[PDB]
Subunit: 99 residues, 4 copies
């Protein structure tokens, strides 16, 4: 039941190109315990109606969770993911690199 720090990965479903519709993902992996605060950001503002998968687990109880939303990438808009867990001293913000 020994605690593990989460691994945060912010990416888009398909290679980024403006004007069209796509998906913004925030993959949180290999953490313990279960209770985790995950939020998706658009220009510093929290995104409304974010979808999330069910909490997947391994034999030694390491958790895997995915937070995703439908979005239109533009030249103006900046996207990020905010994660808060018991292992972290402060909430972590991981920015999305349109690359």
């Amino acid at each position: 039941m020994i605690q593990r720090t989460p691994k945060i990965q912010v990416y888009s479903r398909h290679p980024a190109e403006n004007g069209k519709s796509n998906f913004l993902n925030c993959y949180v992996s290999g953490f313990h315990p279960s209770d985790i605060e995950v939020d998706l950001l658009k220009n510093g503002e929290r995104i409304e109606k974010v979808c999330h998968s069910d909490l997947s687990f391994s034999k030694d109880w390491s958790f895997y969770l995915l937070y995703y939303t439908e979005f239109t990438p533009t030249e103006k808009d900046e996207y990020a993911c905010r994660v808060n867990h018991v292992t972290l001293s402060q909430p972590k913000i991981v920015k999305w690199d349109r690359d």
Copy 2:
């Protein structure tokens, strides 16, 4: 691999209350083949950000799928679910009954 018509069920996660946040679900079950068009409606208009589960299956390939969205019910707003499948002669609209 034999034609099965889908069973549509429209319901809310918790007992509905005006002004209180809830979830609107559209459960589609026991259908074949896999390809199905499911849409959640608000006053006749298609809801933008709709979340969906993964397609679960049985031994004889009968499919089960859930379409859900976060919503705040009001007295004015009417909700429904539109389903289109290869078995159906025309798309079926199932209204949400909160009574």
Copy 3:
């Protein structure tokens, strides 16, 4: 984070009939914390090959989990589900009824 005792439900996927293949389910619901020990039993003995769904959660962190296995029911064999959690002093055994 305030504790919640689990609700255990033991059932078969389809109506049971001897000699024919089925699935034995153990649905554990509305519990906190996450760490739960769920085991499916055959004549008091632990079943080695058991599948499980993914841990679903609510706003206040109440958990929902399903443990299932493929089985061929007989009139000799008895089935049950053993659950151990931090909220309980001794593990709870819930028997399956045909």
Copy 4:
């Protein structure tokens, strides 16, 4: 509806080591239609204890499915995955390369 041949990947969850518990995975991806026969083998014999994920899909209906089982690797035992689909003339056997 267009036809797509499945991509089969056979791998272990953690790097394989004799006597230590592991998981054998058979990842089937980018196929159409849905109906697919997947089986995990041990020395040519079909494994009875097999768990499987839910069928995930894209906009153009391309399917993704994972078949997994708990196993203890030895130097003597050989593992493989057998897949049979409508696109294939005969079932395909993909062996698990340990190294």
